[PDB]
Amino acid sequence: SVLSLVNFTVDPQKAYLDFVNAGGAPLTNCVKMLTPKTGTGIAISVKPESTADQETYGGASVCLYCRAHIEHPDVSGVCKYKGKFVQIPAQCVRDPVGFCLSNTPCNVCQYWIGYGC
């Protein structure tokens, strides 16, 4: 449903965020990994790096563009998440995709801004 909806617009990020901000059901079936909560805690990592305050997800499954089979917006054609693991704050696990669309990792520090840098 929400996956079909982001196909009807030129701003899929805004479409998804407006949709969940208006009460729509967040995308489900994100691939939540089981992990030792002993990682560094950076946003995006080759291996799971969740701290005790985070959960780790398979990157493709929390990428709106991957899930909806639409063009990735990066300058190249490369998902930042796909093939990697994405750490999500534990308080935000109800909508991992929305959290990734609403946040950006530190350019120097690689942690989430407002959760690292």
Q: Which does 109 bind (CB under 5 to 8 A by kind): Zn ion, other proteins, none?
A: Zn ion
79 labelled as ligand-binding?
yes
The two three-digit tokens of residue 88, written as one number:
């999500």
* Residue of 5, 33, 44, 92 that binds other proteins (CB under 8 A): 33
Here's the x/- map for Zn ion, 92-111, by CB under 5 A: it reads as --------------x--x--
Q: Which does 58 bind (CB under 5 to 8 A by kind): Zn ion, other proteins, none?
A: other proteins
Diameter of the chain by CA atoms?
Answer: 41
| Interface with Zn ion, residue 82, by CB under 5 A | yes
- Residue list for the binding site for Zn(2+): 63, 66, 72, 79, 106, 109, 117
* Interacting residues with other proteins (CB under 8 A): 29-36, 38, 46-48, 58-61, 66-67, 69, 82-85, 93
